[PDB]
Amino acid sequence: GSMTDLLNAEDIKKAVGAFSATDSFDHKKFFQMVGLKKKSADDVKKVFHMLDKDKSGFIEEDELGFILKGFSPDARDLSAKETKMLMAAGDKDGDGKIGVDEFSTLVAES
Ligand SMILES: [Ca+2]
Ligand SMILES: [Ca+2]
């Protein structure tokens, strides 16, 4: 039920702390620092489902700003700007949302 069950805590601590500044967020650097590239595709799918709050099968623009909080509750929200850029990068169909396969690509291209 937790990210510490899928990832190392000190990896989460250093990755989140790296983006403590605002508008600083880069998803690729983050994903490498947390160790999601070290993980299996199914463990990455486990991450996506935790980030899906409503459990629609997609991460919408409202759920995307709480990405850091999915790894660390204490973490900050992403700005509208940071969220809107991560949505541009992750949305590949123009649906305006991110599905599991799109999320898998994000992590895989990091
Ligand atoms: Ca959702
Ligand atoms: Ca999409």
UniProtKB/Swiss-Prot annotation:
The keyword Transmembrane does not apply. Ca(2+) 2 binds at D91, D93, D95, K97, E102. Ca(2+) 1 binds at D52, D54, S56, F58, E60, E63. It comes from the Eukaryota. It holds the Pfam family EF-hand_7. One of its GO terms (molecular function) is calcium ion binding. AB domain, comprising of helices A and B, is involved in structural stabilization, protecting the hydrophobic core of the protein. It is required for high-affinity binding of Ca(2+) and for Mg(2+)-binding. This is Parvalbumin alpha.
